[PDB]
């Protein structure tokens, strides 16, 4: 029948829920209750980066942990030397509206994308000193939400349709297409082992894919509202998820189950960016109420507040060496907290 | 000094970049970003091409440039996205105006146009952003009301209980029974406009035909009023 297999799907959902419950023996609080607190954490804006004209949406640290590319609505990607507060490059974009910004691990390319349905790849290191667009990846029928670099020749893009796409830059065509979402994907994070990646969509669900055949491994559904941020644990076997429920949820891949929820009573604003620390103990989430919160990833305790911002905090990213965390807000300000 | 020669030259490069940023900040502040929305039948694509005389396959944003009285605008049309606009529309929290174009020729699916306008109006991000509503292709409405094939009362029951508004200023050459339906649509949209306006934003109704030989001066005046109210809000107390 047309509705016959719906019952089978519901039975499978009940079976996976029962499996998750069976694997659920003790919560993370019950296991980490005997661990000393991280203490009261204070960080100050060591360097604030001025120069953007409009709201900053996206940022991404480089591998060297010194160069920082930031994307703003004026149509500009500025590359900052965070140590000296300089501007290495000021790339002017074709489309003023940009949602995502990436920085390749080799430091040769920066990827931008937005409501133009185009992932533009800019070659930083060229014989001519000007940064020229390498290639304009096209084939997405929706706004690009998160572009991330695998290597110098591959790039994973999560867009405004219910699809993610892995592109080979040289050929210019979609190497593979990941489908299975029923809403627009808004964030994307790649595992450290450059083999898996989790995508968070507006379905209140985060799906873990595998970039070798293009089929999803597991799906995690614990949220109520849409998902705006996602970030793997440094270990690579857990990932965080930021939503508009004013809750940040840490899931684990091996147990296929919710691990912990971070949500305080006086927080009713959504989360725009989530990033783990190098040790994974600090989960930094930039909320809509003009500030950021540094949760203890193993105690669900608000163990730090980062204050200075005049508008909505949009992007938030830690360095590879864990020295500093950079938060870019809608008031054209990047702040490097340490 | 205290820093090497290469760092001096890097600081000079940063200064040049900041100079370019200062130069194009003037262009950014002078230009008034405008959002453009409407259904498929609404002739926004026709407008954004008919105003050009006086002044990629799956691309998302189409940009139109035009200046009136040495004041330059930037209209953005969203063309290749999904039905759910809940997420990307927050990128237009700082646009000067929203131009909602409604096809008044077709009587069916006017209720869904009303619903779309209501969703635009009550959006959290779109609060404090006004709307320059354009009831486009009035020529087709005038032709159809004289055609006699279709009736307003079939789709809307309150038309019979609606006399012409006293503030109407129609051209005397048109049939006085046409302006009844012509202003009924405006009243229907203005009820949604005034339901929850409350002073942060207002709707600016207009009637636009196919070409009209001019459509940018209305936007000029309306945006002047919008920016004037925005500036006055700094003294409002």
């Amino acid at each position: 029948e047309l509705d016959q297999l719906r019952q089978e799907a519901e039975q499978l959902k009940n079976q996976i829920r029962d499996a998750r419950k069976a694997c659920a023996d003790a919560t993370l609080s019950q296991i980490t209750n005997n661990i000393d607190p991280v203490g009261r954490i204070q960080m100050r804006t060591r360097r604030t980066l001025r120069g953007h004209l409009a709201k900053i949406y996206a940022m991404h640290w480089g591998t060297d942990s010194r160069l920082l590319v930031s994307a703003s609505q004026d149509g500009k990607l500025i590359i900052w030397d965070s140590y000296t507060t300089n501007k290495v490059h000021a790339i002017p974009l074709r489309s003023s509206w940009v949602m995502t910004c990436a920085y390749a691990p080799s430091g040769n390319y920066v990827a931008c994308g937005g409501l133009d349905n185009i992932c533009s790849i800019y070659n930083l290191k060229t014989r001519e000193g000007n940064v020229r667009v390498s290639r304009e990846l096209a084939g997405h029928t929706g706004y690009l939400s998160c572009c991330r670099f695998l290597d110098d020749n591959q790039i994973v893009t999560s867009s405004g349709d219910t699809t993610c796409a892995l592109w080979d830059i040289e050929t210019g065509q979609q190497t593979t297409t990941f489908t299975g979402h029923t809403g627009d994907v808004m964030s994307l994070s790649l595992a450290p082992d450059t083999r898996l990646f989790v995508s968070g969509a507006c379905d209140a669900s985060a799906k873990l894919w595998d970039v070798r055949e293009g089929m999803c491994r597991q799906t995690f559904t614990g949220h109520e509202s849409d998902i705006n941020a996602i970030c793997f644990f440094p270990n690579g076997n857990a990932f965080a998820t930021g939503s508009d429920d004013a809750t940040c949820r840490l899931f684990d891949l091996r147990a296929d189950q919710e691990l912990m929820t971070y949500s305080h009573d006086n927080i009713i604003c959504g989360i725009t960016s989530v990033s783990f620390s190098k040790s994974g103990r600090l989960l930094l989430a930039g909320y809509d109420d003009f500030n950021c919160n540094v949760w203890d990833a193993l105690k669900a305790d608000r163990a730090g507040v980062l204050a200075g911002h005049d508008n909505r905090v949009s992007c938030l990213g830690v360095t590879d060496d864990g020295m500093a965390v950079a938060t870019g807000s809608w008031d054209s300000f990047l702040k490097i907290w340490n | 000094c205290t820093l090497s020669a290469e760092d001096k030259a890097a600081v000079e490069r940063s200064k040049m970049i900041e100079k370019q940023l200062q130069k194009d900040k003037q262009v950014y502040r002078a230009t008034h970003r405008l959002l453009l929305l409407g259904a498929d039948n609404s002739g926004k694509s026709t407008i954004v091409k008919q105003m050009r005389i006086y002044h990629v396959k799956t691309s998302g944003i189409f940009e139109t440039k035009f200046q009136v009285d040495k004041v330059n605008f930037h209209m953005f049309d969203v063309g290749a996205q999904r039905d759910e606009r809940r997420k990307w529309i927050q990128c237009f929290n700082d646009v000067t105006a929203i131009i909602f174009v409604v096809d008044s020729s077709d009587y069916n699916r006017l209720q869904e146009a009303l619903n779309d306008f209501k969703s635009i109006w009550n959006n959290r991000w779109l609060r404090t952003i006004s709307v320059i509503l354009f009831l486009n292709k009035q020529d087709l409405l005038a032709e159809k009301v004289l055609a006699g094939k279709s009736k307003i009362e079939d789709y809307f029951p309150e038309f019979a209980r609606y006399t012409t508004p006293e503030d109407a200023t129609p051209e005397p050459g048109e049939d006085p029974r046409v302006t009844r339906a012509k202003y009924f649509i405006r009243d229907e949209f203005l009820r949604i406009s005034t339901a929850s306006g409350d002073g942060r934003h207002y709707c600016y109704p207009h009637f636009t035909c196919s070409v009209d030989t001019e459509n940018a001066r209305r936007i000029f005046n309306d945006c002047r009023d919008i920016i004037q109210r925005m500036h006055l809000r700094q003294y409002e107390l």
Partner: single-chain antibody
Amino acid sequence: VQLVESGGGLVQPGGSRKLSCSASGFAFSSFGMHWVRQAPEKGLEWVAYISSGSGTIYYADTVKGRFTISRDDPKNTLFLQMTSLRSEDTAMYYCVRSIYYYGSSPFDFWGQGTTLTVSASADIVMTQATSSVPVTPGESVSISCRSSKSLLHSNGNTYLYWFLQRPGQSPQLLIYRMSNLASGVPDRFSGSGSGTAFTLTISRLEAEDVGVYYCMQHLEYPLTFGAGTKLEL
């Protein structure tokens, strides 16, 4: 990218001469320009430098007032006026490209050069070995240089540059900051230093590596070159 120079020839002493460098193939606006002399038999010596925007102009002590530099950006050209050209100026001139930011590689491209012949100071002096090192192909060369001042700035960069000049074209960059390799040179080259003494090691010698190897410091202006160490086959 190419940098073609116009000028040069026989000039009487005390005269004036205008030399131009036309840059075709790259963004001339974002790049600093340098002028480098080379005597008919001796080595190199820095002359003048103009930055992006003509806002930071430097000269060597020996050319402090005699020469003046000027960049015309719209047509992508760099001129210099030479006043009171004495016999000490009978050197070939090179229009050297440069760019400065984090990770940048200054002194990338060198123009072919024009021959200008004239008829009849706490600088960081850099010293190399004798300009005669007998090396055969397939072996490892261990050129060495010494600096009068430690080039390790507080940043962590030793502003050292090693260049190669074949008997033909203009010198090309091999390594910058004593460790970083140039864009096009092979991986056979390497550089190791401690702040005062530096070594350029070629782990494998080929027939195209014959030439004269030149040193550079960049801690502070003026820029001192050194005599140069020559490899012979």
